[PDB]
Amino acid sequence: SMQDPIADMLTRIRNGQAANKAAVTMPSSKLKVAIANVLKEEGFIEDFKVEGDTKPELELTLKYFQGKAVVESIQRVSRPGLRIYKRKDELPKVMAGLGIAVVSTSKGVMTDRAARQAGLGGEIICYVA
Amino acid sequence: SLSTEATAKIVSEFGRDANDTGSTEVQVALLTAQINHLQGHFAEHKKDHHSRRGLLRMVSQRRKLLDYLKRKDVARYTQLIERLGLRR
Amino acid sequence: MLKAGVHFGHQTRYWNPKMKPFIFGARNKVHIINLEKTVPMFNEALAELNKIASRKGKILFVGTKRAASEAVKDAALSCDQFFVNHRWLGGMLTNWKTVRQSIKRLKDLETQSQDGTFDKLTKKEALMRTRELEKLENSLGGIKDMGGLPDALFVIDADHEHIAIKEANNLGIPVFAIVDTNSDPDGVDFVIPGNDDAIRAVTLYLGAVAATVREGRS
RNA sequence: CGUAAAGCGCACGCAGGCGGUUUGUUAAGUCAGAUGUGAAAUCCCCGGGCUCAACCUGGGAACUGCAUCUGAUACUGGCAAGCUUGAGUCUCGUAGAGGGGGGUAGAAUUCCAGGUGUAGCGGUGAAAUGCGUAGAGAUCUGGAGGAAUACCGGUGGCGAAGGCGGCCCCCUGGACGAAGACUGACGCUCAGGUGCGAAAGCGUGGGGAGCAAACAGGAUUAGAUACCCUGGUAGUCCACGCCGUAAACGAUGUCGACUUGGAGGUUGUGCCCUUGAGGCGUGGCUUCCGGAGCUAACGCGUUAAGUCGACCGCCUGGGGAGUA
Ligand SMILES: [Mg+2]
Ligand SMILES: [Mg+2]
Ligand SMILES: [Mg+2]
Ligand SMILES: [Mg+2]
Ligand SMILES: [Mg+2]
Ligand SMILES: [Mg+2]
Ligand SMILES: [Mg+2]
Ligand SMILES: [Mg+2]
Ligand SMILES: [Mg+2]
Ligand SMILES: [Mg+2]
Ligand SMILES: [Mg+2]
Ligand SMILES: [Mg+2]
Ligand SMILES: [Mg+2]
Ligand SMILES: [Mg+2]
Ligand SMILES: [Mg+2]
Ligand SMILES: [Mg+2]
Ligand SMILES: [Mg+2]
Ligand SMILES: [Mg+2]
């Protein structure tokens, strides 16, 4: 059931991508957005778009560089069944540094490079590379 | 499974008006209606095991709905079960 | 823009999902390809095609079917170009080194047709040895001499030529090919939409390819 | 955890876990900093002392922890009030071996009665046992009774599973579709618990045509406690109540979202000179084939065994043992 949307996002992406699908949409939310943000701002998607009002609709434009998709792997990490939280010193780094980890902090949803520089930590929503 | 006349009658006896059809109280009451009706179908027969399944489904549906109301508006809950005559 | 009078598209169901981007069809139980997206594929098509033909064109107009074999042993055959118009003896690229002597037997025989031994031995051996040569001739004509190693490859019907194309992909050979709606692209580097087993789209583009190798740098 | 160990036979559901979307607030989880504390030894790093080393020793580092204070508010939790797509309710219809009860029909078998008719019938590989001169079998007519419903009939349909096929009425469950209207997260899952659950089997009473464990006879065979034959009891049928198991199998737990295609079957519904027995769409279910992908392979493949998440069940070498 709907129960975990954020994985559903991570997934609708993962999938469409593997389906060399141009765009991809889904029910939106404060949260979906903030991540679609980091995802664009870190250059894993072209650009997002939320087209509705009562029943908002996040829409992401996918990217493809060579022939490949740009997003080579996108996984949940925290989840309803099992929440993950890391302190600053204990934040994770994906692919040695390449690619990134989305972490939500008391100062908003930012990357790991980010939250690290911000000197704090929070819930590690997902990994991406 | 209950009449249009009958089901209507009760919407009109429990909701704001005919149309306020999905009002908690209403659902409960037109459920409660069919359950009781049925008591006699299963009085005779009794081996109608299959149909029995549907009836329980009615009871547990109603049960969950009753549970909802109570949490929401306790005031409305109590009135209901009195007026519907259950929860001994 | 268009030039293909009546090759429009072709091929009914049997359509290959991956061939959607070049389809605008839907006429009476059959796709018309996207005419207006084929021609931008003469651009690039005959371009890197020629861009090498002046760097020196070695080709292989590979295309078979007792229904267009001869129409390939043509000005397709004639120019800076080799060809195959019969059963693609599998491994003829990937095993050229074995096959290279299936050549020696062709020559060392016809070179000896109106020469060498010939009207001699028995009049059994006679046409009972020209059957050796006849057989060889088709499927191993166009090969004759391969002077400059097979360099690009131009194929009529992508999938019908499973093997040919495959070998290329394996040996790093450009493969220019036209792909009907039904066929699987991506085996083909330079892809050309539109019909691939009708007497026109052949000759047309076929003949038109002969026209760009046969002239690049005088 | 399809076929190797492993999905409970099926469902409903308490506790529990998890839970769409918006704004406010809370600050428990979470995060930040500060302070105290985290015995020494030990470990580790750099040294120093015993001829070296083990050994001894200086000083750091480390003790990933705990608590207090103050902060941060994205996520989670709490409180509040909403929201409409999740989930329900309502309206008219549609298909159906879905369930329960009662009624009823023709075809056959067995039996009873009678006409005609006469020496065999029946059965096997071949036989014999058996049946017939008290007239069999064969045929015809009338009658009794039980059991099951040919054709339709179909990788057809319904049900949670078990499983449900003549026809008719009554009672009744679920599913699906088309419009909009109402509720407003009322949801998902579910250890425990409760219900249902083929056949055989048990209890009391019926009922008994055919079939048939047991048992008897006849054969076959080296033997024949069998396979075959002639018989035939429980049982197979009804009511009431037990039992609770099956290769209860898709050997594939339930719910949700996402991801190229192709040819059927079945069932709703919108549009098109209905002007064709149709034309183009749009749901539910179903069979075959097949792409990525997955797989030890076989295979699966939008009805997943692909890609993800929520909860539950279960596996941890064979035998011993699903035994004590
Ligand atoms: Mg097993
Ligand atoms: Mg099961
Ligand atoms: Mg949310
Ligand atoms: Mg210490
Ligand atoms: Mg020393
Ligand atoms: Mg909150
Ligand atoms: Mg009779
Ligand atoms: Mg009779
Ligand atoms: Mg019904
Ligand atoms: Mg039971
Ligand atoms: Mg029984
Ligand atoms: Mg009995
Ligand atoms: Mg017997
Ligand atoms: Mg068992
Ligand atoms: Mg398949
Ligand atoms: Mg399909
Ligand atoms: Mg799955
Ligand atoms: Mg036991």
Curated annotation (Swiss-Prot), chain A:
GO function terms (MF aspect): rRNA binding; structural constituent of ribosome
rRNA-binding found in the keyword field: yes
Top-level taxon of origin: Bacteria
Record has RNA-binding as a keyword: yes
Keywords for the protein's UniProt record, in alphabetical order: Repressor, Ribonucleoprotein, Ribosomal protein, RNA-binding, rRNA-binding, Translation regulation
Coiled-coil features, chain-numbered ranges: none
InterPro entries (alphabetical): Ribosomal_uS8 (IPR000630), Ribosomal_uS8_CS (IPR047863), Ribosomal_uS8_sf (IPR035987)
Any one Gene Ontology BP term: regulation of translation
Matching Gene3D superfamilies: 3.30.1370.30, 3.30.1490.10
SUPFAM superfamilies xref list: Ribosomal protein S8 (SSF56047)
Cellular component terms (Gene Ontology): cytoplasm; cytosol; cytosolic small ribosomal subunit
A Pfam family that the UniProt record links to this protein: Ribosomal_S8
Oligomeric form and interacting partners: Part of the 30S ribosomal subunit. Contacts proteins S5 and S12.
Role noted for this protein: One of the primary rRNA binding proteins, it binds directly to 16S rRNA central domain where it helps coordinate assembly of the platform of the 30S subunit. Protein S8 is a translational repressor protein, it controls the translation of the spc operon by binding to its mRNA.
Family named by the database record: Belongs to the universal ribosomal protein uS8 family.
Protein name: Small ribosomal subunit protein uS8
Organism: Escherichia coli (strain K12)
Phylogenetic placement of the source organism: Bacteria, Pseudomonadati, Pseudomonadota, Gammaproteobacteria, Enterobacterales
Gene from which this protein is expressed: rpsH
Curated annotation (Swiss-Prot), chain B:
Record keywords: Ribonucleoprotein, Ribosomal protein, RNA-binding, rRNA-binding, Translation regulation
GO biological process, one term: cytoplasmic translation
Superkingdom of the source species: Bacteria
GO molecular function, one term: small ribosomal subunit rRNA binding
Keyword set includes Ligase: no
Entry GO terms, CC: cytoplasm; cytosol; cytosolic small ribosomal subunit
SMART domains per UniProt: Ribosomal_S15
Role of this protein: One of the primary rRNA binding proteins, it binds directly to 16S rRNA where it helps nucleate assembly of the platform of the 30S subunit by binding and bridging several RNA helices of the 16S rRNA. Binds to its own mRNA, stabilizing it 5-UTR and preventing its translation.
Protein name: Small ribosomal subunit protein uS15
Species of provenance: Escherichia coli (strain K12)
UniProtKB/Swiss-Prot annotation, chain C:
Record-linked InterPro entries: Ribosomal_uS2, Ribosomal_uS2_bac/mit/plastid, Ribosomal_uS2_CS, Ribosomal_uS2_flav_dom_sf
Gene3D superfamilies associated with the record: Glucose-6-phosphate isomerase like protein, domain 1, Helix hairpin bin
Pfam families found in the cross-reference section: Ribosomal_S2
Recorded superkingdom: Bacteria
GO biological process, alphabetically ordered: cytoplasmic translation; ribosomal small subunit assembly
Gene Ontology MF terms: structural constituent of ribosome; zinc ion binding
Keyword Ribosomal protein: yes
SUPFAM superfamilies, per the entry: Ribosomal protein S2
Subunit field text: Part of the 30S ribosomal subunit, contacts bS1. Some nascent polypeptide chains are able to cross-link to this protein in situ. In collided ribosomes contacts ribosome rescue factor SmrB.
Described function: Required for ribosomal protein bS1 (rpsA) to bind to the 30S subunit.
Protein name per Swiss-Prot or TrEMBL: Small ribosomal subunit protein uS2
Organism of this sequence: Escherichia coli (strain K12)
Lineage per the UniProt record: Bacteria, Pseudomonadati, Pseudomonadota, Gammaproteobacteria, Enterobacterales
